[PDB]
Amino acid sequence: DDNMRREVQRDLLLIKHRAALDPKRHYKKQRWEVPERFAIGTIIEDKSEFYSSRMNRKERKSTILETLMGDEASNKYFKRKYNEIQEKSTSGRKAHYKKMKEMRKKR
Amino acid sequence: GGAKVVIEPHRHAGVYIARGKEDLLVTKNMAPGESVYGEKRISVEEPVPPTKVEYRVWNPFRSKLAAGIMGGLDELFIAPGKKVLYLGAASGTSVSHVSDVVGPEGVVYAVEFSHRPGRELISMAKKRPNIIPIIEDARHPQKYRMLIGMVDCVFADVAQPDQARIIALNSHMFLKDQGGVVISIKANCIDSTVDAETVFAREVQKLREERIKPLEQLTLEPYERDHCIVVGRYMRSGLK
Amino acid sequence: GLKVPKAVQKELPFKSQIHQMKPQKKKTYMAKRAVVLGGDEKKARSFIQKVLTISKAKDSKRKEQKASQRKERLKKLAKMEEEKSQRDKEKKKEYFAQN
Amino acid sequence: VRKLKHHEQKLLKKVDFLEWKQDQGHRDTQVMRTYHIQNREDYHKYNRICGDIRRLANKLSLLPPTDPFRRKHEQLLLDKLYAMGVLTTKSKISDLENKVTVSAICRRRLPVIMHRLKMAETIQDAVKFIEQGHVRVGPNLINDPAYLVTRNMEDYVTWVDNSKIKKTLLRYRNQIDDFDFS
Amino acid sequence: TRKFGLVKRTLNTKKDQRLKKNQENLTRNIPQVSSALFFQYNQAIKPPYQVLIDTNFINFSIQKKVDIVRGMMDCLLAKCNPLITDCVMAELEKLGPKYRIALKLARDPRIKRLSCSHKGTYADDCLVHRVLQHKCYIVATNDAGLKQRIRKIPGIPLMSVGGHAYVIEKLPDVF
Amino acid sequence: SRVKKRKKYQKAQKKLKSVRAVYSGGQSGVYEGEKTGIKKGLTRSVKFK
Amino acid sequence: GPYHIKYAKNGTHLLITGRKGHVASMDWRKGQLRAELFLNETCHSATYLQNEQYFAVAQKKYTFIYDHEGTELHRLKQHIEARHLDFLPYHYLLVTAGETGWLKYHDVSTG
Amino acid sequence: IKDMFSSAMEVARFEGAQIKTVSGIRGEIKRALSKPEGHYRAAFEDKILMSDIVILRSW
Amino acid sequence: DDQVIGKARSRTLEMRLNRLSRVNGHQDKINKLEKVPMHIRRGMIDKHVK
Amino acid sequence: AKLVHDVQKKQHRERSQLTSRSRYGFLEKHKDYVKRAQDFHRKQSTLKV
Ligand SMILES: [Zn+2]
What we know:
The structure is cut from a larger assembly and holds 10 protein chains of 9 kinds.
Chain C: H1 6-9, H2 29-33, H3 40-98
Chain I: H1 6-21, H2 27-30, H3 38-49
Chain J: H1 30-48
Bound molecules: zinc ion.
């Protein structure tokens, strides 16, 4: 229902925009609109092998978004990449225009 | 390892994709609560309260049929209501995945000739009731012609040089008309004096000589060197 | 932006009329009512925004780079097709000149 | 009618219960669907006049190419049909065989003129409006859809005053002056 | 309280599915390039080669007095298995009683023979399909159109009667 | 002349991963997943005739 | 106007035509009509063809042919003034006569 | 245009000459202005900017 | 010409245009036959040959 | 480059705004002017429409 789509609506956005989560992962080009019938499930790593794929009890979370937010290297990359996209996008638009005008005006 | 995925139905009916940051080929679990060969599982809570149903990761490096699915086959004939005759059910590795793709309303006849794999097949077919284990040589289908009737797809994971004769005998006995014939050909186990394309061309020619029209072949190369899946249908009258 | 004059845009046809909506000056009740969540929810909002703009700027970089690729492939492809057509229109005249 | 099998479709190929050869591909139906023509016989009443124009155009092109009778009557017929609006260009005389057409006479009808003048959103809306008696050409109210509007007579296609449609377009732009009733 | 713009209902040739031209009421497929191939090398073929013959290759062999298996052997310096498809054989039989010599030289126990499964006897279509399916075949031909088809599809060596012996082109290990 | 063919063969066998799918050597460790995506619409298999 | 009556060759369907315009094809023994069409010119006669699924009506001048639900299939440019229509069911022929002194046989299957 | 000339006599000497900005906008000098001395009126291909320099290429 | 009335004029002009266009135009494109059915074109040919 | 020297197809560097005339920032050159002019022309074209 829409009541559950309004709870998993963020990690579906993360899976849609997989390609810009890690700068080294580089998926194959699909579109992936939200499928009509899906189900959100949790991986059971069993009690046979330890320590390799094991995410412990102290760091298991409830979405993909909390894991990506708990990752501190991804936070470094997202903040840095967002600041450089920001200062590229505000490169010559309006603060530049009015500081050029104030440069003309000051003398 | 404790992460969360989204399950999504594949193009093929009965099999699914779990999307995360690496996406997994996944089937529903017919016997929930245990793994068969140590694969990982996914437990969804589907909505009396909701019930925890679960799913099993199909490993393409331990299954020729999963290597074929995720290399991209236009039509598998293993479908969610069908009957599959698995030849060379070497353990319960791929037979479990074929079994729960086929579902509770369909039947998988798992034919194997060795006996310790047969013991593991019977102990797996306890918790998967839609598996009929048949411990017999597939080179003589008359020795088990009484136990199986009118299958819809044959899958052949035998690795013997008389493969095409085994496939033809089992198809002529138990396959129905315009049913599925999925073959996993291993070039080195057929013969190693010629190259892989020569032995695949000869095996496809043998299939159409035994009137199984090939629709499609796939090399399944990143998972197995010099393998192939040939998907055909049992035409029985008029390959033309 | 394109600033179309008011004397022109009041005298436009019905299909060509320009939907320009005025800003809101009154603190309306639905805006003063509506709740926003804080802390973990506002950092989730910040995270989703950063992820979506990184995805959109990566896609724009990729399609601009593909535009720069395919204009020069168009250039070399048109040169090779011009050389080919020159060779065809001289071989045809050779053929007919012999026959 | 039952999707004949192979032996039946081979054995009776010319059988067709809908499309016949005298139908001419249902083009009366086709252009009366395009331009929303009420009565069945307007296509053929126009087809007679197109056949008159093309019969005269044949019999007039069969004259020698330089005599002033042929040149005068070809130019005179070309001018008359352009002024009436059936022909869209009075340049070449092959229009008198090729471009003279029931669809051209049907594009000159009153609802099609209306729809091209943006006076109604579709030809069926224009039919409904001039049936409801909103449209006058000149001073006098025109009531039937089939009215053919020549080139000089399409400058006077307006709405009647005291029309609710005229009132709502004026009040949409709130230029409604209630002194002159709208 | 009638409706306005009333019309006579006729049939719509654009819409009505009862008539025949309106009886016309995704998964892609990009076939992977073969694992037998390097870029254009075809690294997988190895002697004993197997060579698909067609009818003008046989006719030019008899016109130039080259034996089939011995001409193949001293062209490639390898052991050859020549293959006559049933459509090439059908074409040689359809050539009439002028070509009896060519037909009963194609009837040779040293020349093995495949079994094509299609309708019609178009050998160029059959040879092109079964060679671009598998890439384990040499094509021996002298048709200009078939030579252009085969040398446009990659990794397929092409043999042809030229002069008084066979020549081979797209096989990069001939000496 | 030797280092040039060493570095245009490394380029060639990096391009070969693009056109085909190259058998890299099998499953390295635990099966992590497909790591690049799964397309349910594309079928990269050779159909007959 | 006065209603020309016509029954299908098994008695299941009735086809009435008013003189003014009112043509109705109906299942007279259930209460199911399947065509009621008001063709405002003076109709004269009608007949079924091989079924209740097609019927031919003789209108002001031209004979028209309508399908089961009453959409017009054909306007016959011959059959200039019919007053009498009759179908020949073993031969599939619509026979037409009227104010002209002409008798016209029209094959319904081929057209 | 402000200072390439020192006097209206100099501009009168150079009337009608083709100038251009550094943007390649071509132009022509038309008439010396009266009260500021070396200042003149030029006409260009389109609107030049305040951050430009005009150029009279002589030899 | 300037004295040739109808059917002679149409067929005369058509004959001249055919004879001019048969040099550079293609032989499969200059003389297009009118589409006549098989069983009546063959009867036309048989009666004309008779 | 068939008969051209690489010391001949060098890189001519572009000049900056004069420091006396520096409050009107960025002396604009022909690429900047064409970016200005075609913008003005497309906006005048849609205004005329
Ligand atoms: Zn063949």
